[PDB]
Design a protein around this ligand. Sequence first.
Ligand SMILES: CCCCCCCCCCCCCCCCCC(=O)OC[C@H](COP(=O)(O)OCCN)OC(=O)CCCCCCCCCCCCCCCCC
Ligand SMILES: CCCCCCCCCCCC(=O)OC[C@H](COP(=O)(O)OCC[N+](C)(C)C)OC(=O)CCCCCCCCCCC
Ligand code: SF4
Ligand code: SF4
Lengths: 233, 190, 64, 61, 120, 123, 239, 181
Amino acid sequence: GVSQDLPAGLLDDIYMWATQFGDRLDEIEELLTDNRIWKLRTVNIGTVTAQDALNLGLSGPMLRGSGIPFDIRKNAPYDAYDKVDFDVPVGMNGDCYDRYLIRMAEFRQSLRIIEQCCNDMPAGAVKVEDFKINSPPRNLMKEDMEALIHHFLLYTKGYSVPPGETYTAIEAPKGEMGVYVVSDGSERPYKCKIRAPGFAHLGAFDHIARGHFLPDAVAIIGTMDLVFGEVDR
Amino acid sequence: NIYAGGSAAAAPPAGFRIHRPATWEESEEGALSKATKYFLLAEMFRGLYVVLEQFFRAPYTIYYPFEKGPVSPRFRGEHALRRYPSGEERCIACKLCEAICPALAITIDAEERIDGSRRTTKYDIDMTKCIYCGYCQESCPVDAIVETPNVEYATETREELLYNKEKLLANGDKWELELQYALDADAPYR
Amino acid sequence: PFDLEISTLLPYVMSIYLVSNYGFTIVLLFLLILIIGFVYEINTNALKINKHNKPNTDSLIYKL
Amino acid sequence: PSVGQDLPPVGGYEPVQWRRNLPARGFRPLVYLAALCGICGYGFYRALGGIQERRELKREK
Amino acid sequence: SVLVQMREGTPIGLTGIYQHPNPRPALIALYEATLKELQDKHPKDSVYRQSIENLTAHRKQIVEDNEVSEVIENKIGAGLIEEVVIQAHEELELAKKMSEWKPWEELEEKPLEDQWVYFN
Amino acid sequence: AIIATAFAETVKFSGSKQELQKRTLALYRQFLRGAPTFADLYEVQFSIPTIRTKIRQEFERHRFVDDLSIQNVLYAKGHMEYQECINFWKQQAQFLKYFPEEDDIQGRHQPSNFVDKFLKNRA
Amino acid sequence: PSWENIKDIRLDPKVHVDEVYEPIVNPADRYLQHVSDLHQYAKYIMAALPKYIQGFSVWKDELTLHVAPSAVIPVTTFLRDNTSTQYKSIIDITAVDYPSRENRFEVVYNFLSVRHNSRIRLKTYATEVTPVPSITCLYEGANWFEREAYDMYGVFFEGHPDLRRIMTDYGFEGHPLRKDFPLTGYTEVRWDEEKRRVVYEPLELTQAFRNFSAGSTAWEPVGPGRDDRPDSFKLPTPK
Amino acid sequence: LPGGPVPVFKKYTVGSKGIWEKLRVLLAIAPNRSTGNPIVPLYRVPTPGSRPEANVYQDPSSYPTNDIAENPYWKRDHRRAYPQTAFFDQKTVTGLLELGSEATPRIADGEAGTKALANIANGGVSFTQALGKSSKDVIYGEVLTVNGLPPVAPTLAPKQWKIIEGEAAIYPKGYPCRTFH
Ligand SMILES: CCCCCCCCCCCCCCCCCC(=O)OC[C@H](COP(=O)(O)OCCN)OC(=O)CCCCCCCCCCCCCCCCC
Ligand SMILES: CCCCCCCCCCCC(=O)OC[C@H](COP(=O)(O)OCC[N+](C)(C)C)OC(=O)CCCCCCCCCCC
Ligand code: SF4
Ligand code: SF4
């Protein structure tokens, strides 16, 4: 779950931020979306076809810009994405300008989801209610013997994970982020490999950037949305 | 019906094929209006106006260090070792902080005190190894090790950032009141 | 050449009244001749850097 | 149970604006073209009148 | 010859794939070719052959029964008709490679006993 | 597509030791030929003959390896190292890892017998 | 109609629940029908390529195929190009070190089919001297993944056009993700004033690494689990 | 259309008053746009360190997990009821083809069934002889579909896409970005 519950005045403050973020987005769009220089730098720059996008391992906007409607939040719903209403933007030219439009629309859809969460936040626990997995609350830890034992063990040994393996993926902001974790049944993962979307995007750079000018390369790097801690883990 | 190599969800949605791009001759706007927009840079002027509107709005800047950005009771800053109201140390050397520490930043030594108490003889934090995650403070069964809200302790030498037990206890003594505000605000949530 | 063309108009603008209508006709002829050269430059695409690599547009054909 | 938890209002919050809001402003383009023509024509009227009067001053000198 | 993929012309909504001029004959031809390849190089017993035959027969029946592209792609359920042509071509090349690979046989590398032992 | 870089060789495990011997001697020739380029890229103090001597010593080290698979791996890694050196992908710091002897005398006391090693707790 | 009189949301009546009701459900249950489907699907694949598929495994929504290295190119081709599979995107390639096995390394491929909204995993094996066939011919995106697998583990990929280190330092000796490679390696760097350059030296740590895994539990923690196999994939009992 | 423009006085930003408000309304590109400065008396007030709710907060719990009288831990111990990974090599699938399944058997009773299971478990029947021997009924029911088609790569939750056009779209007609729901 999460480590602590939300503090008392947070939903109200998130709502007040949300009431003005739309204008904040409109002004950026005023500077960029119709600017002819912005279009000169982005239109037909870093084009990727749909088939090549699939073959290269691209995901997220890098894929949705080429016309393919795929998004893990809709295709394989996780935590609460099935309970909220939002739309998915899909490009058609597979270029930097289509990807920019996709990201700007995703801003709006995130604002939508944040408002729905502010309206539908339910009562109850925020972590799983088994003290063999997550630590019990502190007033139990200092009063109840089982709670103290479980707290001691969780912070010194850790919980044991049943042996096995999984590849698990989510629609991270930069594309499909996955982990492949192998458990040997102990408290420490046997193997943990991170699948970073930026890794595959930078791999596809040589195919995408060929025949462009150097400033086009700068624009393509920017459109891939690279953070290098992701790239080299 | 029955699908072969496919399914209803892999069928194209209604309207997935895009409409044909329009040619120049099927344009609603006459060439003179388009040329006016082209030569007089209409959207560029709109962008300049949007930028100029900001010039008459309130800026966001604060005058640090005379003003300060927002800080919350949960904030993770420099470490301290706390006491009981009697003045006795709270740490009883359980070593749960040392075990949980993801950066192995804590080094602890203990034995029986001459009065029989279980107490530390050495408590070190390498602040240049620490990742300021707060796991030690969550793990402690007696609220002994804490993170204050203090961030202003930059040093001129690295040796000054190897905190021993005296330094950490002095930090607890120095910051106890702010620590009590933070605890009074966040203890129910832990 | 374009710089010399432009700078050759300095004697005209400094003598426009004195040469009025005859020189106006002459300077028009001079400008038109230079504009023919501008036309040549524009139509030959002489200052365009062509991106050598272009997307392949050939169809995919299979011999069945 | 649940006491003291951050929760939403009973009726909910008023809807926020999330759709694109970039309304079209300004006269139609031909109005700007007409204004430009009028400004330039008036300026040419003044400049040519000034040139002609300057020539008559040259005659006097 | 068969026109598989148009790489210019009217864009359809997927980058790099353009509108096919005459897709139904292309589909029928490619489907004929793959049925012929299976019949001439694949054992009648092999499961691969039975499955690809039945699938190709099903899709060929759908194409021949229907003149309109949107009806066809709703009944096939595997994308726009251009993508269906690309799929048929892919299946044909796979069948021809399968003829040489001979997957209906017994497996050639058995695993050692330790090979697939995990922690359970 | 994703194209290979300067002096890249696709990985191929030679089925025979003689077909590997040909490739190996070709790699040795490549190293010897690149020695002056190396001395220019990496601004070295020492001479071109010293570089070529070092290359010979490297190739000598595996002169008696028998198993074909091991020789294949040694060759593929040696080619990787050649590509790294000739493309200036290495900096001077990593290139000079190969020349520990070229640095000056580290000190007066490098023990050789038992007593000297025992006096330094290295016996 | 001004911001001066905007309503205070902070004093609106909040929702108040008396008791929260969250029924007890095993998360695995939601997978059961899907598990059956995967079994059926895997059976088909194994019946179609019996020359190649050593086996398969099914865990909740993840299907793994196990093949010999020489099987990689045909099976992968099938997975990419068959009409019922259509796994067009390569997601990742990595290796896992199992030092107890005669073949140390298992090579893992994950594939995605956007057409069918489906994932699949394929495993093979390798050692420090026996390579695997590169799948760059089938997926360009595989390129860098195989490089990482070579850099971290030392697995070679036959047919890879440009196979070199991608993560580690130039001239780095070792493959750090092997179980026998030590956590902090063998060498460290510093700036040397005498030589005016960054130098490499044998590792020396001011504080030695403390390995707390000695405190692992003395009692078996989870037990056997339960089997979720469908009844159509269990051998019958006589009578 | 929900999500559409809302006036500036419904946004929690400072803004202008008096004659200056008239000037701003006359001179704004979009008069309904806020300035972005939060209203000081309303925003993040009271401070998180002085919330009254802190002195009434209790650890939240759900029924029946919090019951003191009817929940043994082992009835909700989901970690220890984890699904086993099912491994199938070709011998097992051979057995499934020949002898049928627990669900639908094709085995005889007594020593016959145990000996059949044993001799497939030893290597007597190979997978390919297993497949060739298999009848049409077996091959269609239990390898292919009942229609003879192969099964498609299965999906846990199928997603039907719809395209939103017109006013509810995110961008207008011209832009090369469509709205999928
Ligand atoms: C209607 C009849 C008209 C009769 C003839 C017109 C008389 C002359 C009119 C005066 C203005 C002419 C000079 C501006 C012409 C600009 C034309 C243009 O758009 O250039 C476009 C050029 C790309 O070329 P192109 O291929 O044609 O565009 C297609 C893109 N898909 O790409 C570009 O160069 C982009 C445009 C360059 C803009 C430069 C911006 C620099 C600074 C902006 C100045 C704005 C004002 C600053 C002052 C502050 C405001 C007070
Ligand atoms: C191709 C261009 C065609 C334009 C035709 C416009 C004619 C309209 C009639 C008004 C003239 C008038 O009546 O005003 C006369 C003016 C000023 O002279 P004045 O001193 O007032 O007259 C007294 C005569 N004296 C001095 C002998 C006593 O003369 C002008 O030069 C102004 C002409 C208007 C400007 C036209 C320029 C067009 C833009 C050119 C951009 C390349
Ligand atoms: S804050 Fe985290 S890293 Fe720092 S000492 Fe505490 S547990 Fe260790
Ligand atoms: S600070 Fe707390 S957790 Fe750490 S040793 Fe002392 S009592 Fe134990």
